[PDB]
Symmetry: D2
Subunit: 366 residues, 4 copies
């Protein structure tokens, strides 16, 4: 059984008047359509398609339980949380780097975080075999005291520290396949060996200029952070090989008691915020690889937490195939972009380059 | 002096109710924002920024002259033009492959085509040194009998045939740096040596699966078509080397009497419809290379014709830098994405791959 | 217990590329925002608010069962249904007057109709005490052979004829407070005494020019149709008096076995498609009058069926107060427009005119 | 010769993240389409249609020159101007009641104001016979120290005080047919006899609850302010009579040297922000009454200044007929809503009430 953790009010968070990610003003003309990049529909349309296909009726949807302040302050200093609340009450703002929010965004962020907490809690309790948390706002860029890149709270780290306090879990692996670097997760556990943090991301995209393969942790955490930068334009076969040659072997060696996927859908082939070429069947297969790892390593315990994804028209098909895999349910959904996205895939010269790139990352892991 | 060819009604063309490029229906939910991918604002926002900067007041803007049926039938069979008009009167439709239009789309396509005809005409007659035509709908995928990929009339080929009839021009080169393959231009002049057709495009993107480096023309046109596919994820340095090592030498060898650029802006770093990493200063520099080529080979005679470009927030900055180069004008516009897009650029390993790719294209040309 | 009948796919119906209700083309520029007037969000935002307030958790939400062909053919000729299905399969169209739809609109209309059928069926069988059907597309303008005014099937009449076939109910009253005339309901039952059809509507609005107070039925149906036109600019007190002096006495005289409210929310104070001045507490009060009537006349059997409503920002508050009344529940929702809409209400001179108007309608009823 | 005063950057002002006029947060869900009520397109679409019809080519369009600090401080205290600029430099805000703006909103307000200043200046200097200023943001609610109701500077009063300085003009009449009360204009000149301020508006609409027929000025201004409240639901014949029986006689008695119309188009039949029933031919006729008055009283000197208007689909046709009248030009534009709006007009009983209402206003004027 699969739990699906969602709440209407996560779709009411609004980043404000931006054209894509550009703040209005100076030379940036206001948009005439939907404002922003992290739009409500770039996440709701996934849920909409899961309703329309009949898939949601196969899942269990618990009522949302917001994070408490005690929950979030296992990661964040209370001063940040207090300033967040005060700014949110006053009409919204931005307390970090590219992390805007509107009035009431504090309550919505606390709610979104609670979806991740409860998804992990219910999987560890045996209430469901696995779970999907449709978080919005996302979490994986948020530092302990600095929100960034549309992330206002560290959703997954907070869910992990709650699981440690409630269940005493020893080892957790986070597999971050959102197309951007999970710098928040990396930072929060950088000197710890009990959380393996893996990030696969477009080389140099966000944070801009960052690659990170050499950043493997510090102190007790040395060897427990793993960055897999991939070149812009990499597609299905590049991601499959990175998972076969790097990600899955890392999980096997670490022996986690729980696997958490930070699942952004923005490596899809038409996303504006990156340059990758994944399609809906890429996400099905990557999910199947994680289902296999969780079955082999930690009794099936697998939690998928929504992060990025900005192509409103194509994110739903990528997320829906993921959910079909997670739940083991077949529906009648047909991805109308798949044939073209398969034709888009890199040819042999690019494929050789991607294979050589991943071989080098493996060799450098020693 | 730069002429700028535009008309309000080009922004009234509407592709219909699609989510991005996906027709609504079946599993595709209707969009709540702007419908379509070729949206009015993905072109109008370029014009808006050039007004706001003061650039437009330095250009000359002739009143638009629509193409006549006689003009367009120098390329298209009258039967296609007649069916286009009848379908447009009847409420719109799609007479080709991914070329939808609404009621009245026939008249707007004829108007758009007339912007290209007149821009070429005015440069050849000496009224302006160079020109930019803000065509919408675009033209470079349209075959003689089949519209395709948002292109309903073969804008540049029709403008070329009109210039041959009115001015007797002998040799024309078309430099197509829209991110997609200019298959319409290639097809229409494929057996002809009087028009050199060059397309730089994302490998396998649109038409899907097509690369085309070996397709060099046929009969008298053998050696007068030149495809430069580039891998997904290529950016500024790759395009610059492609122009220095392939495009500009091809122009030098051909000795054109007029250079026409098919300028789509969809190779920009955040376009949803391709995977490339150009930024606004890429377009400025590529335009300077074309201005230099025209100055050396054909008395400065250079026409730039708008094609694709789908990132509403970033296309304006790319086109504005292009227009500053074309006109030689300075404004106070600053691209707020430029620093980040510079950081996004491919690192050393990908750069070596791009150089190996272009070196192979050069070697294959003999 | 209140049943709430909704299905995700009702929000996927799309009227097409119109600016408000105006088809694109000729002098109508395409919209840059949401296309259309009957937008998905003009109905979904009511459901969104009911989720956010916690009210949906207090209701029972049965799974949708679409109308069958047998159901809809109790009202519509099979030829209409077949041409609708064939046009829908082929990409959508408009088979009547201002009733456009997209590919697959047939199945969505059959589903929307099933919400009304099930709401009536479940109230008559005692599964719920009363019910709300969030129909989209709406039904009350649809004639037996002709769709019109955004209405593709005659939702309420189909649900009535189904109820007669499955429960043998003798007398049904329809109270239509959508701001436009329920010409479809009026036509379908015009010569019948077993369905009392009451419409309160803005004088001359839609169908344009129609008032209708003298159209009281024909044959056996003479005295069983009741039109209550109200002048543009009428508000809360005018509607309340119309219900106290005309609508409720007609219900009392008729002795229905079931009351169905055709509930459009477009008499609200900021609707673009009418000129009325109702606010959220108007809808609470009018709903309470129908609850009281149903308690007194037919054992509490009350069904409310969504029709029109076009102000996306204010329809939610009006419908939410209606749902609070229907379910007898209170939430923390506060209407932020209420104070201003109360200040907007007609003053003493206009109020005297409205009383004079309603008194004339009463006197004419003999 | 008609001057048309417009600048691209007036369409870049953005009120922010509101659903219609409701700020997001608490119970107001963010919009998925265009944010706000005063949207860019609610004004630009009028300009767009005037381009498409060919009418703009018949007008003279001078380059905009913004208001100076000296210009605006003839009306506003320097402290307000300084706080406006500081807030705008720092990201936007709202310094009054329902007057939000974005970053750089100060420069755009100064530019908008300069359009009105120049339109008045050029008519008085004889450069054009009459003029239309497409102001955005609007002006007529702004008080000397408090912005209000989407108005950030007192556009028309600033233009008048500039005309007194530059031309020494003695008497100006302002005729405000925006559907809301021109409380800014009324307040600024309330004790002055050299400016006659007339406002026709929906009774009690905005400012909410205000009617004002008894507020006729104070001191030297007693008799030089004239409020004409009209009931909600009034249409063409009611406005025509108000102008024949009240407005034009007031102009004839006052003997102005210049007539300025504060032209909001929000009395149109489908505006969300009022309940009136004007159509495009109403605005043509009211403009002709003002042209006739200016020719009779002040040598043709007539300036029309855009204020409100929120129906994006219908405002263009209303303003376009206004511009045809003002310029004395005919185009091929046909209003596709006209026939329906004519059928919507009040019937005989409502028409008698409107006539009695206006007779009463006249009687109270003594
Ligand atoms: O040159 C061009 C044309 C770009 C076309 C982009 C590809 C869109 C496409 O192929 N869409 C589609 C695919 C399958 C089914 C429906 C639509 N734009 O600048
Ligand atoms: O002249 C004008 C101003 C119209 C302003 C109408 C806005 C309505 C309003 O005041 N709304 C509101 C009230 C309280 C809280 C939030 C919004 N427009 O043309
Ligand atoms: C490209 C500029 C901003 C990108 C933010 C990325 C957030 C995410 O991880 O989805
Ligand atoms: C053009 C104004 C009215 C159009 C049809 C409205 C249908 C309804 O909601 O009843
Ligand atoms: K990642
Ligand atoms: K190309
Ligand atoms: K009605
Ligand atoms: K007014
Ligand atoms: Zn991301
Ligand atoms: Zn293209
Ligand atoms: Zn209605
Ligand atoms: Zn107004």
């Amino acid at each position: 059984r699969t739990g699906f953790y969602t709440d209407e009010r996560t779709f009411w968070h609004a980043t404000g008047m931006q054209a894509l990610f550009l703040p209005v003003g100076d030379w940036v003309q206001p948009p005439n359509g939907t404002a922003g990049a992290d739009t409500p529909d770039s996440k709701r349309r996934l849920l909409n398609l899961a309703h329309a296909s009949g898939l949601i009726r196969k899942l269990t949807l618990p009522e949302a339980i917001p994070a408490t302040v005690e929950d979030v302050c296992r990661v964040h200093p209370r001063d940040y949380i207090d300033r967040f609340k005060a700014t949110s009450d006053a009409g919204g703002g931005d307390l970090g780097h590219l992390a805007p929010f509107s009035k009431g965004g504090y309550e919505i962020a606390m709610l979104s975080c609670g979806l991740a907490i409860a998804a992990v809690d219910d999987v560890l309790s045996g209430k469901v075999d696995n779970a999907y948390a449709l978080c919005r706002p996302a979490g994986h860029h948020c530092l302990a005291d600095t929100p960034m890149g549309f992330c206002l709270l560290a959703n997954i780290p907070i869910a992990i520290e709650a699981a440690k306090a409630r269940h005493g879990i020893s080892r957790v692996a986070v597999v971050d396949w959102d197309v951007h670097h999970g710098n928040g997760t990396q930072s929060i556990f950088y000197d710890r060996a009990d959380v393996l943090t893996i990030s696969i991301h477009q080389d140099r995209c966000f944070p801009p200029g960052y690659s990170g393969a050499e950043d493997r942790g510090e102190g007790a955490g040395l060897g427990y952070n793993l960055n897999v930068p991939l070149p812009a334009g990499a597609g299905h076969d590049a991601y499959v090989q990175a998972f076969d040659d790097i990600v899955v072997p890392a999980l096997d060696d670490f022996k986690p008691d729980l696997i958490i996927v930070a699942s952004g859908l923005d490596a899809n082939s038409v996303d504006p915020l990156a340059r990758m070429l994944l399609h809906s069947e890429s996400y099905r297969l990557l999910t199947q690889k994680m289902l296999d790892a969780a079955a082999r390593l930690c009794g099936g315990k697998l939690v998928v937490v929504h992060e990025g994804g900005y192509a409103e028209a194509y994110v739903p098909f990528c997320g829906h195939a993921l959910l079909e895999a997670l739940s083991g349910e077949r529906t009648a959904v047909v991805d109308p972009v798949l044939e073209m996205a398969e034709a888009w895939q890199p040819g042999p010269e690019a494929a050789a380059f991607h294979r050589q790139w991943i071989d080098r990352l493996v060799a450098d892991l020693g």
